[PDB]
Write a protein that binds this ligand. Structure first.
Ligand SMILES: [Cl-]
Ligand SMILES: [Cl-]
Ligand SMILES: [Cl-]
Ligand SMILES: [Mg+2]
Ligand SMILES: [Mg+2]
Ligand SMILES: [Mg+2]
Ligand SMILES: [Mg+2]
Ligand code: NA
Ligand code: NA
Ligand code: NA
Lengths: 176, 189
């Protein structure tokens, strides 16, 4: 792979987000192979799990996701951690989203990592955060952390980033 | 919440399909609200983490990912768990095949963990997650992927894979999910 030379970037759709057909020469460890790859750029995002160490609860959201609705999610409804697309800086973005989606204006946030979520053909990078909490088309779900972790096992929670956050919180010992 | 499809426009359909979907969603109170969303359908896939309890190692892979290269990954190389699109195979048949094709290991027993939507804002993709123990005597070839692919196979201490999440050397959603599931399982203690 090491040597990469861009040959062509063709826009297949710029309706709002952008789909590309990208051609690049790749030099195999062994030999020059020309790859043609479809790449979808819907920009980057951030997500945040809200947790309360006193009550032992977490705050998640439930909303209709049409992309799950066309792909085996019968009602389209999906339980997720609070998230939003980023022009804002990650921490600026996620503080907006927290107020706008959950109603909590949160103090200190803790950043976990930045992960590409679907690198086969989508650019999307997600900024992951957690925050303590106190005091739309989106339902705010407050639930016991113990119930949320169990919802991962039954398949009631079936969102990538949401599982990643909940597992981090579990491994952090913050709720112990 | 009543949902009704109004219009499904095909924006692109070379092999995978990009849609622009207009839909009506009924609120609490009974009010119908029209929305429009782009939906990218690349189909579903499966992924597997291979682990070895004697050597305390995992097998991962490294390949060029253009989607990351255009978005902050300087070399475009990404460390990932072995994975492939279902491609009209059932998840376990898919993942057993991808494991030998990409890593060279022919695996025995697998454990299904969960099935997760990875990017549900505008991407259809559901990923079936697997783990399996591997043994050195189960390696029939060097792997490397198929067709135009150039996949590098990585075998490393599990504790070093975990270390790499913190340093950003591993920064792939499905891979971190698996490494963390393995950490929590105690299988590697
Ligand atoms: Cl329906
Ligand atoms: Cl409701
Ligand atoms: Cl580039
Ligand atoms: Mg949102
Ligand atoms: Mg693959
Ligand atoms: Mg194949
Ligand atoms: Mg191909
Ligand atoms: Na492609
Ligand atoms: Na893929
Ligand atoms: Na490669």
């Amino acid at each position: 792979t090491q040597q990469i030379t861009l040959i062509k970037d063709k826009i297949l759709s710029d309706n709002y987000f952008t789909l590309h057909n990208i051609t690049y020469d790749l030099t195999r460890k062994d030999e020059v192979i020309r790859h043609k790859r479809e790449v979808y750029d819907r920009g980057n995002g951030a997500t945040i799990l809200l947790y309360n160490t006193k009550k032992k609860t977490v705050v998640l959201i439930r909303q209709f996701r049409v992309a799950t609705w066309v792909n085996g999610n019968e009602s389209g409804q999906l339980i997720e951690s609070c998230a939003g697309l980023l022009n804002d800086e990650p921490e600026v973005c996620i503080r907006k989203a927290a107020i706008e989606e959950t109603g909590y204006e949160v103090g200190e946030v803790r950043k976990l990592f930045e992960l590409y979520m679907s690198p086969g053909g989508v650019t999307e990078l997600i900024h992951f955060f957690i925050a303590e909490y106190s005091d739309e088309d989106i339902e705010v779900l407050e639930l016991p952390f113990s119930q949320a972790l169990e919802m991962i096992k039954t398949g009631e929670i079936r969102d990538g980033k949401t599982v990643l956050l909940l597992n981090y919180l579990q491994t952090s010992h913050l709720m112990d």
